[PDB]
Write a protein that binds this ligand. Sequence first.
Ligand SMILES: Nc1nc2c(ncn2[C@@H]2O[C@H](COP(=O)(O)OP(=O)(O)NP(=O)(O)O)[C@@H](O)[C@H]2O)c(=O)[nH]1
Ligand SMILES: [Mg+2]
Ligand SMILES: [Mg+2]
Ligand SMILES: [Mg+2]
Ligand SMILES: [Mg+2]
Ligand SMILES: [Mg+2]
Ligand SMILES: [Mg+2]
Ligand SMILES: [Mg+2]
Ligand SMILES: [Mg+2]
Ligand SMILES: [Mg+2]
Ligand SMILES: [Mg+2]
Ligand SMILES: [Mg+2]
Ligand SMILES: [Mg+2]
Ligand SMILES: [Mg+2]
Ligand SMILES: [Mg+2]
Ligand SMILES: [Mg+2]
Ligand SMILES: [Mg+2]
Ligand SMILES: [Mg+2]
Ligand SMILES: [Mg+2]
Ligand SMILES: [Mg+2]
Ligand SMILES: [Mg+2]
Ligand SMILES: [Mg+2]
Ligand SMILES: [Mg+2]
Ligand SMILES: [Mg+2]
Ligand SMILES: [Mg+2]
Ligand SMILES: [Mg+2]
Ligand SMILES: [Mg+2]
Ligand SMILES: [Mg+2]
Ligand SMILES: [Mg+2]
Ligand SMILES: [Mg+2]
Ligand SMILES: [Mg+2]
Ligand SMILES: [Mg+2]
Ligand SMILES: [Mg+2]
Ligand SMILES: [Mg+2]
Ligand SMILES: [Mg+2]
Ligand SMILES: [Mg+2]
Ligand SMILES: [Mg+2]
Ligand SMILES: [Mg+2]
Ligand SMILES: [Mg+2]
Ligand SMILES: [Mg+2]
Ligand SMILES: [Mg+2]
Ligand SMILES: [Mg+2]
Ligand SMILES: [Mg+2]
Ligand SMILES: [Mg+2]
Ligand SMILES: [Mg+2]
Ligand SMILES: [Mg+2]
Ligand SMILES: [Mg+2]
Ligand SMILES: [Mg+2]
Ligand SMILES: [Mg+2]
Ligand SMILES: [Mg+2]
Ligand SMILES: [Mg+2]
Ligand SMILES: [Mg+2]
Ligand SMILES: [Mg+2]
Ligand SMILES: [Mg+2]
Ligand SMILES: [Mg+2]
Ligand SMILES: [Mg+2]
Ligand SMILES: [Mg+2]
Ligand SMILES: [Mg+2]
Ligand SMILES: [Mg+2]
Ligand SMILES: [Mg+2]
Ligand SMILES: [Mg+2]
Ligand SMILES: [Mg+2]
Ligand SMILES: [Mg+2]
Ligand SMILES: [Mg+2]
Ligand SMILES: [Mg+2]
Ligand SMILES: [Mg+2]
Ligand SMILES: [Mg+2]
Ligand SMILES: [Mg+2]
Ligand SMILES: [Mg+2]
Ligand SMILES: [Mg+2]
Ligand SMILES: [Mg+2]
Ligand SMILES: [Mg+2]
Ligand SMILES: [Mg+2]
Ligand SMILES: [Mg+2]
Ligand SMILES: [Mg+2]
Ligand SMILES: [Mg+2]
Ligand SMILES: [Mg+2]
Ligand SMILES: [Mg+2]
Ligand SMILES: [Mg+2]
Ligand SMILES: [Mg+2]
Ligand SMILES: [Mg+2]
Ligand SMILES: [Mg+2]
Ligand SMILES: [Mg+2]
Ligand SMILES: [Mg+2]
Ligand SMILES: [Mg+2]
Ligand SMILES: [Mg+2]
Ligand SMILES: [Mg+2]
Ligand SMILES: [Mg+2]
Ligand SMILES: [Mg+2]
Ligand SMILES: [Mg+2]
Ligand SMILES: [Mg+2]
Ligand SMILES: [Mg+2]
Ligand SMILES: [Mg+2]
Ligand SMILES: [Mg+2]
Ligand SMILES: [Mg+2]
Ligand SMILES: [Mg+2]
Ligand SMILES: [Mg+2]
Ligand SMILES: [Mg+2]
Ligand SMILES: [Mg+2]
Ligand SMILES: [Mg+2]
Ligand SMILES: [Mg+2]
Ligand SMILES: [Mg+2]
Ligand SMILES: [Mg+2]
Ligand SMILES: [Mg+2]
Ligand SMILES: [Mg+2]
Ligand SMILES: [Mg+2]
Ligand SMILES: [Mg+2]
Ligand SMILES: [Mg+2]
Ligand SMILES: [Mg+2]
Ligand SMILES: [Mg+2]
Ligand SMILES: [Mg+2]
Ligand SMILES: [Mg+2]
Ligand SMILES: [Mg+2]
Ligand SMILES: [Mg+2]
Ligand SMILES: [Mg+2]
Ligand SMILES: [Mg+2]
Ligand SMILES: [Mg+2]
Ligand SMILES: [Mg+2]
Ligand SMILES: [Mg+2]
Ligand SMILES: [Mg+2]
Ligand SMILES: [Mg+2]
Ligand SMILES: [Mg+2]
Ligand SMILES: [Mg+2]
Ligand SMILES: [Mg+2]
Ligand SMILES: [Mg+2]
Ligand SMILES: [Mg+2]
Ligand SMILES: [Mg+2]
Ligand SMILES: [Mg+2]
Ligand SMILES: [Mg+2]
Ligand SMILES: [Mg+2]
Ligand SMILES: [Mg+2]
Ligand SMILES: [Mg+2]
Ligand SMILES: [Mg+2]
Ligand SMILES: [Mg+2]
Ligand SMILES: [Mg+2]
Ligand SMILES: [Mg+2]
Ligand SMILES: [Mg+2]
Ligand SMILES: [Mg+2]
Ligand SMILES: [Mg+2]
Ligand SMILES: [Mg+2]
Ligand SMILES: [Mg+2]
Ligand SMILES: [Mg+2]
Ligand SMILES: [Mg+2]
Ligand SMILES: [Mg+2]
Ligand SMILES: [Mg+2]
Ligand SMILES: [Mg+2]
Ligand SMILES: [Mg+2]
Ligand SMILES: [Mg+2]
Ligand SMILES: [Mg+2]
Ligand SMILES: [Mg+2]
Ligand SMILES: [Mg+2]
Ligand SMILES: [Mg+2]
Ligand SMILES: [Mg+2]
Ligand SMILES: [Mg+2]
Ligand SMILES: [Mg+2]
Ligand SMILES: [Mg+2]
Ligand SMILES: [Mg+2]
Ligand SMILES: [Mg+2]
Ligand SMILES: [Mg+2]
Ligand SMILES: [Mg+2]
Ligand SMILES: [Mg+2]
Ligand SMILES: [Mg+2]
Ligand SMILES: [Mg+2]
Ligand SMILES: [Mg+2]
Ligand SMILES: [Mg+2]
Ligand SMILES: [Mg+2]
Ligand SMILES: [Mg+2]
Ligand SMILES: [Mg+2]
Ligand SMILES: [Mg+2]
Ligand SMILES: [Mg+2]
Ligand SMILES: [Mg+2]
Ligand SMILES: [Mg+2]
Ligand SMILES: [Mg+2]
Ligand SMILES: [Mg+2]
Ligand SMILES: [Mg+2]
Ligand SMILES: [Mg+2]
Ligand SMILES: [Mg+2]
Ligand SMILES: [Mg+2]
Ligand SMILES: [Mg+2]
Ligand SMILES: [Mg+2]
Ligand SMILES: [Mg+2]
Ligand SMILES: [Mg+2]
Ligand SMILES: [Mg+2]
Ligand SMILES: [Mg+2]
Ligand SMILES: [Mg+2]
Ligand SMILES: [Mg+2]
Ligand SMILES: [Mg+2]
Ligand SMILES: [Mg+2]
Ligand SMILES: [Mg+2]
Ligand SMILES: [Mg+2]
Ligand SMILES: [Mg+2]
Ligand SMILES: [Mg+2]
Ligand SMILES: [Mg+2]
Ligand SMILES: [Mg+2]
Ligand SMILES: [Mg+2]
Ligand SMILES: [Mg+2]
Ligand SMILES: [Mg+2]
Ligand SMILES: [Mg+2]
Ligand SMILES: [Mg+2]
Ligand SMILES: [Mg+2]
Ligand SMILES: [Mg+2]
Ligand SMILES: [Mg+2]
Ligand SMILES: [Mg+2]
Ligand SMILES: [Mg+2]
Ligand SMILES: [Mg+2]
Ligand SMILES: [Mg+2]
Ligand SMILES: [Mg+2]
Ligand SMILES: [Mg+2]
Lengths: 393, 82, 205, 60, 85
Amino acid sequence: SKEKFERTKPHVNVGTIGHVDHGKTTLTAAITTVLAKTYGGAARAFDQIDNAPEEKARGITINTSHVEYDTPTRHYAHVDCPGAADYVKNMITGAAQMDGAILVVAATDGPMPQTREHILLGRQVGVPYIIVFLNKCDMVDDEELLELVEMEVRELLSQYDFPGDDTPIVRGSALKALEGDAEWEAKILELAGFLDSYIPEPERAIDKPFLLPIEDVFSISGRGTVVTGRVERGIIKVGEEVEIVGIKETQKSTCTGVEMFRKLLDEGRAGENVGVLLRGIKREEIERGQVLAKPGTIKPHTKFESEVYILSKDEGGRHTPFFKGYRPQFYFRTTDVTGTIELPEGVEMVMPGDNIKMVVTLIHPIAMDDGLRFAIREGGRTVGAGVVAKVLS
Amino acid sequence: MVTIRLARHGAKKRPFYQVVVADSRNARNGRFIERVGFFNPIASEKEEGTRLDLDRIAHWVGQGATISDRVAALIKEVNKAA
Amino acid sequence: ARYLGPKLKLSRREGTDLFLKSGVRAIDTKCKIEQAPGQHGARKPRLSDYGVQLREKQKVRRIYGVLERQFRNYYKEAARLKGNTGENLLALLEGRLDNVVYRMGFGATRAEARQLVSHKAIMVNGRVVNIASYQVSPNDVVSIREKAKKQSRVKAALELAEQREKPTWLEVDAGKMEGTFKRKPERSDLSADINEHLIVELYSK
Amino acid sequence: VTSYIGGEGHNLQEHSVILIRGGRVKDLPGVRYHTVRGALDCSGVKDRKQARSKYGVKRP
Amino acid sequence: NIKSAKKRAIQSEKARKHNASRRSMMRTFIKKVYAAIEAGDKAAAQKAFNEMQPIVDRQAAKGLIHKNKAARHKANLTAQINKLA
RNA sequence: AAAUUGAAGAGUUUGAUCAUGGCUCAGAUUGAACGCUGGCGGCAGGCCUAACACAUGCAAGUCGAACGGUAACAGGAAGAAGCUUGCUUCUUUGCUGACGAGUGGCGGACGGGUGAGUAAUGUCUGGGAAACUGCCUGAUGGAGGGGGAUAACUACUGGAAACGGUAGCUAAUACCGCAUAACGUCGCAAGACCAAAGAGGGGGACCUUCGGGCCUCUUGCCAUCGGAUGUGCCCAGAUGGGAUUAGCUAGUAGGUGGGGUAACGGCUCACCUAGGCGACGAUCCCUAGCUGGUCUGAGAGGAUGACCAGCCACACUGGAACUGAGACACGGUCCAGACUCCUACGGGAGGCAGCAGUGGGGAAUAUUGCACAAUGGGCGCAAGCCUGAUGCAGCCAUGCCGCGUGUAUGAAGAAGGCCUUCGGGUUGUAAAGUACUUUCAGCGGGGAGGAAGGGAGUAAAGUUAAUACCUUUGCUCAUUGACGUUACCCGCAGAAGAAGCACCGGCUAACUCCGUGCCAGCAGCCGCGGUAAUACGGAGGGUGCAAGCGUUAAUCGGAAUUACUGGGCGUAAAGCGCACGCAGGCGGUUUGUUAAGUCAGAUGUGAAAUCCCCGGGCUCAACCUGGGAACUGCAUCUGAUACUGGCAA
RNA sequence: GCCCGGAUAGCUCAGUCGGUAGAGCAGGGGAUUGAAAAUCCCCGUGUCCUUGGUUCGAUUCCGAGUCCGGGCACCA
Ligand SMILES: Nc1nc2c(ncn2[C@@H]2O[C@H](COP(=O)(O)OP(=O)(O)NP(=O)(O)O)[C@@H](O)[C@H]2O)c(=O)[nH]1
Ligand SMILES: [Mg+2]
Ligand SMILES: [Mg+2]
Ligand SMILES: [Mg+2]
Ligand SMILES: [Mg+2]
Ligand SMILES: [Mg+2]
Ligand SMILES: [Mg+2]
Ligand SMILES: [Mg+2]
Ligand SMILES: [Mg+2]
Ligand SMILES: [Mg+2]
Ligand SMILES: [Mg+2]
Ligand SMILES: [Mg+2]
Ligand SMILES: [Mg+2]
Ligand SMILES: [Mg+2]
Ligand SMILES: [Mg+2]
Ligand SMILES: [Mg+2]
Ligand SMILES: [Mg+2]
Ligand SMILES: [Mg+2]
Ligand SMILES: [Mg+2]
Ligand SMILES: [Mg+2]
Ligand SMILES: [Mg+2]
Ligand SMILES: [Mg+2]
Ligand SMILES: [Mg+2]
Ligand SMILES: [Mg+2]
Ligand SMILES: [Mg+2]
Ligand SMILES: [Mg+2]
Ligand SMILES: [Mg+2]
Ligand SMILES: [Mg+2]
Ligand SMILES: [Mg+2]
Ligand SMILES: [Mg+2]
Ligand SMILES: [Mg+2]
Ligand SMILES: [Mg+2]
Ligand SMILES: [Mg+2]
Ligand SMILES: [Mg+2]
Ligand SMILES: [Mg+2]
Ligand SMILES: [Mg+2]
Ligand SMILES: [Mg+2]
Ligand SMILES: [Mg+2]
Ligand SMILES: [Mg+2]
Ligand SMILES: [Mg+2]
Ligand SMILES: [Mg+2]
Ligand SMILES: [Mg+2]
Ligand SMILES: [Mg+2]
Ligand SMILES: [Mg+2]
Ligand SMILES: [Mg+2]
Ligand SMILES: [Mg+2]
Ligand SMILES: [Mg+2]
Ligand SMILES: [Mg+2]
Ligand SMILES: [Mg+2]
Ligand SMILES: [Mg+2]
Ligand SMILES: [Mg+2]
Ligand SMILES: [Mg+2]
Ligand SMILES: [Mg+2]
Ligand SMILES: [Mg+2]
Ligand SMILES: [Mg+2]
Ligand SMILES: [Mg+2]
Ligand SMILES: [Mg+2]
Ligand SMILES: [Mg+2]
Ligand SMILES: [Mg+2]
Ligand SMILES: [Mg+2]
Ligand SMILES: [Mg+2]
Ligand SMILES: [Mg+2]
Ligand SMILES: [Mg+2]
Ligand SMILES: [Mg+2]
Ligand SMILES: [Mg+2]
Ligand SMILES: [Mg+2]
Ligand SMILES: [Mg+2]
Ligand SMILES: [Mg+2]
Ligand SMILES: [Mg+2]
Ligand SMILES: [Mg+2]
Ligand SMILES: [Mg+2]
Ligand SMILES: [Mg+2]
Ligand SMILES: [Mg+2]
Ligand SMILES: [Mg+2]
Ligand SMILES: [Mg+2]
Ligand SMILES: [Mg+2]
Ligand SMILES: [Mg+2]
Ligand SMILES: [Mg+2]
Ligand SMILES: [Mg+2]
Ligand SMILES: [Mg+2]
Ligand SMILES: [Mg+2]
Ligand SMILES: [Mg+2]
Ligand SMILES: [Mg+2]
Ligand SMILES: [Mg+2]
Ligand SMILES: [Mg+2]
Ligand SMILES: [Mg+2]
Ligand SMILES: [Mg+2]
Ligand SMILES: [Mg+2]
Ligand SMILES: [Mg+2]
Ligand SMILES: [Mg+2]
Ligand SMILES: [Mg+2]
Ligand SMILES: [Mg+2]
Ligand SMILES: [Mg+2]
Ligand SMILES: [Mg+2]
Ligand SMILES: [Mg+2]
Ligand SMILES: [Mg+2]
Ligand SMILES: [Mg+2]
Ligand SMILES: [Mg+2]
Ligand SMILES: [Mg+2]
Ligand SMILES: [Mg+2]
Ligand SMILES: [Mg+2]
Ligand SMILES: [Mg+2]
Ligand SMILES: [Mg+2]
Ligand SMILES: [Mg+2]
Ligand SMILES: [Mg+2]
Ligand SMILES: [Mg+2]
Ligand SMILES: [Mg+2]
Ligand SMILES: [Mg+2]
Ligand SMILES: [Mg+2]
Ligand SMILES: [Mg+2]
Ligand SMILES: [Mg+2]
Ligand SMILES: [Mg+2]
Ligand SMILES: [Mg+2]
Ligand SMILES: [Mg+2]
Ligand SMILES: [Mg+2]
Ligand SMILES: [Mg+2]
Ligand SMILES: [Mg+2]
Ligand SMILES: [Mg+2]
Ligand SMILES: [Mg+2]
Ligand SMILES: [Mg+2]
Ligand SMILES: [Mg+2]
Ligand SMILES: [Mg+2]
Ligand SMILES: [Mg+2]
Ligand SMILES: [Mg+2]
Ligand SMILES: [Mg+2]
Ligand SMILES: [Mg+2]
Ligand SMILES: [Mg+2]
Ligand SMILES: [Mg+2]
Ligand SMILES: [Mg+2]
Ligand SMILES: [Mg+2]
Ligand SMILES: [Mg+2]
Ligand SMILES: [Mg+2]
Ligand SMILES: [Mg+2]
Ligand SMILES: [Mg+2]
Ligand SMILES: [Mg+2]
Ligand SMILES: [Mg+2]
Ligand SMILES: [Mg+2]
Ligand SMILES: [Mg+2]
Ligand SMILES: [Mg+2]
Ligand SMILES: [Mg+2]
Ligand SMILES: [Mg+2]
Ligand SMILES: [Mg+2]
Ligand SMILES: [Mg+2]
Ligand SMILES: [Mg+2]
Ligand SMILES: [Mg+2]
Ligand SMILES: [Mg+2]
Ligand SMILES: [Mg+2]
Ligand SMILES: [Mg+2]
Ligand SMILES: [Mg+2]
Ligand SMILES: [Mg+2]
Ligand SMILES: [Mg+2]
Ligand SMILES: [Mg+2]
Ligand SMILES: [Mg+2]
Ligand SMILES: [Mg+2]
Ligand SMILES: [Mg+2]
Ligand SMILES: [Mg+2]
Ligand SMILES: [Mg+2]
Ligand SMILES: [Mg+2]
Ligand SMILES: [Mg+2]
Ligand SMILES: [Mg+2]
Ligand SMILES: [Mg+2]
Ligand SMILES: [Mg+2]
Ligand SMILES: [Mg+2]
Ligand SMILES: [Mg+2]
Ligand SMILES: [Mg+2]
Ligand SMILES: [Mg+2]
Ligand SMILES: [Mg+2]
Ligand SMILES: [Mg+2]
Ligand SMILES: [Mg+2]
Ligand SMILES: [Mg+2]
Ligand SMILES: [Mg+2]
Ligand SMILES: [Mg+2]
Ligand SMILES: [Mg+2]
Ligand SMILES: [Mg+2]
Ligand SMILES: [Mg+2]
Ligand SMILES: [Mg+2]
Ligand SMILES: [Mg+2]
Ligand SMILES: [Mg+2]
Ligand SMILES: [Mg+2]
Ligand SMILES: [Mg+2]
Ligand SMILES: [Mg+2]
Ligand SMILES: [Mg+2]
Ligand SMILES: [Mg+2]
Ligand SMILES: [Mg+2]
Ligand SMILES: [Mg+2]
Ligand SMILES: [Mg+2]
Ligand SMILES: [Mg+2]
Ligand SMILES: [Mg+2]
Ligand SMILES: [Mg+2]
Ligand SMILES: [Mg+2]
Ligand SMILES: [Mg+2]
Ligand SMILES: [Mg+2]
Ligand SMILES: [Mg+2]
Ligand SMILES: [Mg+2]
Ligand SMILES: [Mg+2]
Ligand SMILES: [Mg+2]
Ligand SMILES: [Mg+2]
Ligand SMILES: [Mg+2]
Ligand SMILES: [Mg+2]
Ligand SMILES: [Mg+2]
Ligand SMILES: [Mg+2]
Ligand SMILES: [Mg+2]
Ligand SMILES: [Mg+2]
Ligand SMILES: [Mg+2]
Ligand SMILES: [Mg+2]
Ligand SMILES: [Mg+2]
Ligand SMILES: [Mg+2]
Ligand SMILES: [Mg+2]
């Protein structure tokens, strides 16, 4: 909180996706040390990406950490996702804000169950583009074995409905590029080139009014409570009226400084992860899931009609019918929430793989409008995608 | 050092100064020996505007008391022969 | 700040005509006056000693268009002033600008006079005044401004004032809408019906 | 201390943080306080119309 | 500390190095008289008094010693010389 | 002429009664909180709790007219070198203005903050000598001639940094002699002894050795005696609760003598005496900043001491001194302690009870804003720089006060609701409907008043050899606002954007119908609910307040329920079981005589604000404000002798 | 942000390793009283915290949640 962030080079939200213990977090560390040395940006290190007691004694990552590496064309903002089956909820928040992923499949093990689960969540939420990275390579000194893993990833993406064969697969060791090997430093400099080439300039919504979903809340010692998240639409000027809408009720507030990776900003534009400092709010009373909207634009609702598309076994979801009283988890912008289903008259049962509308009473109210996209999940897996039809409350 | 200075009372945007003989170290509105007239900048042309008891000024200025930049101008405003 | 409800309802509850909806026509005969305060209008009240005090207070308030907070302030001024506390209560009420504007005949009702005062029409001693509560001092000259002079509401409302008793303490020109408040109003000049003594009794306890 | 729970029905159980105001019930001997309905975990009374500042209920 | 007027710390420290030396000098010349007082006639005591009289008056004029301090060290010290000897 | 115009009761023990006596209620009121609902404005206010812990920026500097600095920086002038000979390169010059770092001055001790401690060291009221006092200001008269240093800068090193050392070198209003000194200090006096600093704005005349000298003038310097303002100390009374705290006390209580204090003193010593306080409450314990006041009261009193004003106290916790006119020093120093801190492990930091802000605590209490424009403050000849002092702005119905949310007409007495003896009533002129406004919001244009000044000029005066420079000035210039899209005005559009929430058995203003059936619930007191509830829940209807309303808590009132004004004690609570009796309270009667009480007068004082009355100014009000009265007092001084006391007889 | 425990008819507790859950204490219906209490004669009065899955069948086995309990961290 000192150096003013100059608005130069387009902002893009990147992040690593893939199986557990697969080089996902270690890739993030390799990208920093490679790009910092040659181009001449800020250095950083691997330990900073995940410290705490929970990511040392174990080794695994839980929290969605963030990194800021710069290149001549664009200014990237990384989002290192967790990866394990237990941490899918706090991942989806990291994956939703992310524009273009970096998938991580490995040349020894290959595509494994979570890789399929991650990319499934990527489609239904919103992950336009994806890039593969083989994160072992050196351990198996062979030409035929390593190239057979590439084939199965192209199959995976194309099977699940991505380009597949068009996606630029890259090979490279994360640990070798951490030290100073000239051949492996250049091969992850190549990944930065693939990020610029394949992923285009993202399409922002800097016109329609302000909204910002809260991904994580902080309490800065001196300044006050801060909320982080990608600005979904509009802009944020310093000293502007902001209404916090969602769970519990609704509270009035004002912004007192927006930032971008511990650097000051004047205008927090759309499509970029920013830490908004709110005035006169406690750490406990503001929770995760709520949205920073402009006063009057959005209203919290506990009941709504919605055109729900239930999934079948082939697409990946339920395989049995259900009646009124069923309670799955509804993932809106960031958080999830439970809700009772009330079906329309003249519909006895809801079969899997079917398009119908339904009234859904939620236990917590969440800020929503007509034409909001959500993805229903239950039992550690997906259920059905859909859209909001009408407001009731 | 004793000094003859304005005290600043009155409402917000509506000042009314009590010209007063006080010690330099004491606060503007605080301690004083004795008040010696007043000043009203938002009085305008009417019955009352500015009063300043010139008999008590000789007791302080004659001995050794300074007069502030504004109170010195009001001694010129009240005049000796005008 | 104002009542702004059913105005003739107040007159039936009180019994007597309060001049709330006096207006263009002289006598109403269009409410079942006296014998219908509400649904249970045929109910004869027992009416205690506190009742008659409260009814008399609420009558004087509703006539002049003043709320308890501002009305209780008139009592506190009336007590501190010289003479008699009862006579001071009502003399201060009569000195209001909205009341004077009504008594001059620049308003069919007292609520009309209040709006006329509030909407930059009324002007006194070469100075525009918005406040209905403006205490009109002895020897004053209230009048209407030339932009809003001889508008449709005033010329008709001034013809009503001929049928009225017309106070002695003030005088009206009538040609150019120019009034003259002269002396303070005497007790015996006005009313001869609303009791002051009972209002003094309500507040002293 | 013991405190009375006014109105019909309540959400209070086991724990749940609540606000207490003064006021004896004059019927339960020992109970000399009232829970403020509406404040904190104590919700408003369900389906009230008349006298709703008491019992902490919003407009219909 | 969080100020640029810390010159007064080093200036007051510089003062008392000087201020203590002139003070210490004075109270030793006064001790020189009290040394002569006790076993002695009017001769050795008054010689020490004539030596300290200029020093005590001087230091009083500089604001180290007050003028009443100096006045006493003549007043009471003459009374030791006059009464005993 | 005006300064008080002031004293209300009701429910509740009983089958009923009168008494006693608690309980509750009607009114003011607040730093309030909470619940429901929220339009504006104006003036006020807004961490009472954890004197809990704290990141970030900021709250005290200032002069070149003290001094070295011929300058760290940016720019003129004598002269230089390139070459587009005025475009560029560039050495000298206090020399362009100034000023980073110093050295010395004055400030930092004021201004802000907070009540932890403190029951007397403090505060209040009234006195009192043993005192000091920077800046200001009266008078007198000095200020004369010298010296050795020393930073900065180098030079050379040490250190991670904070911060040093070692070799020079240099300036002064820094520093110290010396002469010089009295109505000064000391002494019985004779005597002795005690100081200083110089600057800046101009000059005819003559010295020029050019650094000019000498006239000039403003300012400073120094000694004394003074005023003024501060402060230090002393006494008297007053200033909370507990005796289920009765004895405390050895520098303790006083003396003589020495030291010390600006000043007197067990302030502190040495010896000497054996005290001193104590029932008119010492000691110990718990609680507490104090006052002007605030709120309340018919008044006596009772409570309280947020905001504004005085005093004290304290500054991370516990100590000590240094510097100074003033501190045993909020944003100095030095130790030690606890907690945060950074490092290179050697050592270093650090102090929000300045302003914002954070976490935590809590029922609860706000911007990391703008501005020195004004008003004070700091230095300075000034200009100015500095200023979270002050002035504004934001937020918050937290109060007090103003204006809002339409205004006339309107019978089919419509619909719909609600009630009914189904005839009708009532909601209700309510609405709709027609006629009009257009405050305030919302737009669009005018635009004060807070501004006095300061400067560049000038004019005569001031001042002098001088038609100079400074002192005072009066005329001509162009300017100075954070507030600020200002106060307020004028045009626009159209009722348009602008109403709730208590209560309705009695006390206490206002009633029916359904639902429920000692259940659910209400309740400030009495009490409501057991299948026809005016008390519960809803509905209609009313009443009372209305941008507020109620609930909670807190104080007084009513409570003559701690009673001095103003209660009691045969049986309601209450005469010790009955004596004697010291201290204490009270005392027949007549002369004295004082004057303590008492009374009268008079002077001084009782800060300002507050309160009160007559004005005045903001469109009105709250708010601000002039004068008066008052501040019920305390002191002294003169009297009065009836009474009370004293002392005689 | 993640680890863990806790929930069984109105209240206090039994019962389970798939065999479809019970006890007291209440509550209700009737005869009786103005209504009760006792007296007499009859009744569990249940979303096994919610929801889904493995199955013929789940309180009971395995996910996902609810509000609450206590534990460890992150400083734009
Ligand atoms: N030999 C080799 N090992 C590698 C390479 N890249 C990563 N690894 C290793 O794979 C392991 C995975 O660690 P990490 O990347 O933190 O795990 P992750 O991919 O973020 N998944 P999650 O966070 O869910 O545990 C580490 O031991 C890492 O050193 C590579 O190129 N070569
Ligand atoms: Mg593995
Ligand atoms: Mg990871
Ligand atoms: Mg592992
Ligand atoms: Mg494996
Ligand atoms: Mg395998
Ligand atoms: Mg805040
Ligand atoms: Mg003082
Ligand atoms: Mg003027
Ligand atoms: Mg009001
Ligand atoms: Mg009002
Ligand atoms: Mg009364
Ligand atoms: Mg320090
Ligand atoms: Mg230090
Ligand atoms: Mg000195
Ligand atoms: Mg010595
Ligand atoms: Mg020594
Ligand atoms: Mg000599
Ligand atoms: Mg000296
Ligand atoms: Mg000195
Ligand atoms: Mg009175
Ligand atoms: Mg009574
Ligand atoms: Mg009674
Ligand atoms: Mg009895
Ligand atoms: Mg009774
Ligand atoms: Mg009875
Ligand atoms: Mg009786
Ligand atoms: Mg509140
Ligand atoms: Mg509230
Ligand atoms: Mg609240
Ligand atoms: Mg306002
Ligand atoms: Mg204010
Ligand atoms: Mg406090
Ligand atoms: Mg503390
Ligand atoms: Mg602290
Ligand atoms: Mg820090
Ligand atoms: Mg700090
Ligand atoms: Mg800053
Ligand atoms: Mg600072
Ligand atoms: Mg110079
Ligand atoms: Mg000069
Ligand atoms: Mg000096
Ligand atoms: Mg102070
Ligand atoms: Mg102040
Ligand atoms: Mg203060
Ligand atoms: Mg503070
Ligand atoms: Mg205080
Ligand atoms: Mg005193
Ligand atoms: Mg006094
Ligand atoms: Mg006095
Ligand atoms: Mg002097
Ligand atoms: Mg001095
Ligand atoms: Mg000066
Ligand atoms: Mg002088
Ligand atoms: Mg002189
Ligand atoms: Mg000479
Ligand atoms: Mg000589
Ligand atoms: Mg010389
Ligand atoms: Mg020399
Ligand atoms: Mg020398
Ligand atoms: Mg030398
Ligand atoms: Mg040297
Ligand atoms: Mg020298
Ligand atoms: Mg000197
Ligand atoms: Mg000599
Ligand atoms: Mg000599
Ligand atoms: Mg000489
Ligand atoms: Mg001589
Ligand atoms: Mg001599
Ligand atoms: Mg001499
Ligand atoms: Mg002499
Ligand atoms: Mg003498
Ligand atoms: Mg003498
Ligand atoms: Mg002599
Ligand atoms: Mg000298
Ligand atoms: Mg000198
Ligand atoms: Mg010089
Ligand atoms: Mg000169
Ligand atoms: Mg010359
Ligand atoms: Mg002088
Ligand atoms: Mg002088
Ligand atoms: Mg003197
Ligand atoms: Mg003097
Ligand atoms: Mg002193
Ligand atoms: Mg008072
Ligand atoms: Mg009063
Ligand atoms: Mg009173
Ligand atoms: Mg009384
Ligand atoms: Mg008190
Ligand atoms: Mg007190
Ligand atoms: Mg208080
Ligand atoms: Mg305070
Ligand atoms: Mg204030
Ligand atoms: Mg304050
Ligand atoms: Mg104060
Ligand atoms: Mg004092
Ligand atoms: Mg004192
Ligand atoms: Mg102190
Ligand atoms: Mg102090
Ligand atoms: Mg402090
Ligand atoms: Mg200390
Ligand atoms: Mg100390
Ligand atoms: Mg000094
Ligand atoms: Mg000293
Ligand atoms: Mg002194
Ligand atoms: Mg200080
Ligand atoms: Mg200290
Ligand atoms: Mg201070
Ligand atoms: Mg501080
Ligand atoms: Mg300190
Ligand atoms: Mg130690
Ligand atoms: Mg230490
Ligand atoms: Mg320390
Ligand atoms: Mg603070
Ligand atoms: Mg806070
Ligand atoms: Mg809290
Ligand atoms: Mg609050
Ligand atoms: Mg600023
Ligand atoms: Mg400026
Ligand atoms: Mg100034
Ligand atoms: Mg000065
Ligand atoms: Mg000067
Ligand atoms: Mg500063
Ligand atoms: Mg500032
Ligand atoms: Mg307001
Ligand atoms: Mg509120
Ligand atoms: Mg309307
Ligand atoms: Mg109408
Ligand atoms: Mg109408
Ligand atoms: Mg209409
Ligand atoms: Mg119309
Ligand atoms: Mg209009
Ligand atoms: Mg119109
Ligand atoms: Mg307007
Ligand atoms: Mg506008
Ligand atoms: Mg001017
Ligand atoms: Mg102006
Ligand atoms: Mg001038
Ligand atoms: Mg000038
Ligand atoms: Mg000039
Ligand atoms: Mg001139
Ligand atoms: Mg303007
Ligand atoms: Mg401006
Ligand atoms: Mg119209
Ligand atoms: Mg309308
Ligand atoms: Mg029914
Ligand atoms: Mg029943
Ligand atoms: Mg029952
Ligand atoms: Mg029951
Ligand atoms: Mg009720
Ligand atoms: Mg009874
Ligand atoms: Mg019944
Ligand atoms: Mg019924
Ligand atoms: Mg009843
Ligand atoms: Mg009732
Ligand atoms: Mg009812
Ligand atoms: Mg009810
Ligand atoms: Mg009504
Ligand atoms: Mg109503
Ligand atoms: Mg209110
Ligand atoms: Mg209230
Ligand atoms: Mg109360
Ligand atoms: Mg009493
Ligand atoms: Mg009481
Ligand atoms: Mg009695
Ligand atoms: Mg007796
Ligand atoms: Mg008895
Ligand atoms: Mg007795
Ligand atoms: Mg007896
Ligand atoms: Mg006995
Ligand atoms: Mg006696
Ligand atoms: Mg006697
Ligand atoms: Mg006698
Ligand atoms: Mg006697
Ligand atoms: Mg006698
Ligand atoms: Mg006789
Ligand atoms: Mg006689
Ligand atoms: Mg006699
Ligand atoms: Mg006599
Ligand atoms: Mg006599
Ligand atoms: Mg006497
Ligand atoms: Mg006498
Ligand atoms: Mg006498
Ligand atoms: Mg007397
Ligand atoms: Mg007397
Ligand atoms: Mg007298
Ligand atoms: Mg006073
Ligand atoms: Mg009073
Ligand atoms: Mg007026
Ligand atoms: Mg007027
Ligand atoms: Mg006044
Ligand atoms: Mg006065
Ligand atoms: Mg007077
Ligand atoms: Mg007073
Ligand atoms: Mg008084
Ligand atoms: Mg008096
Ligand atoms: Mg006396
Ligand atoms: Mg006397
Ligand atoms: Mg005498
Ligand atoms: Mg006699
Ligand atoms: Mg006698
Ligand atoms: Mg006698
Ligand atoms: Mg039963
Ligand atoms: Mg039954
Ligand atoms: Mg039964
Ligand atoms: Mg039965
Ligand atoms: Mg029966
Ligand atoms: Mg029953």
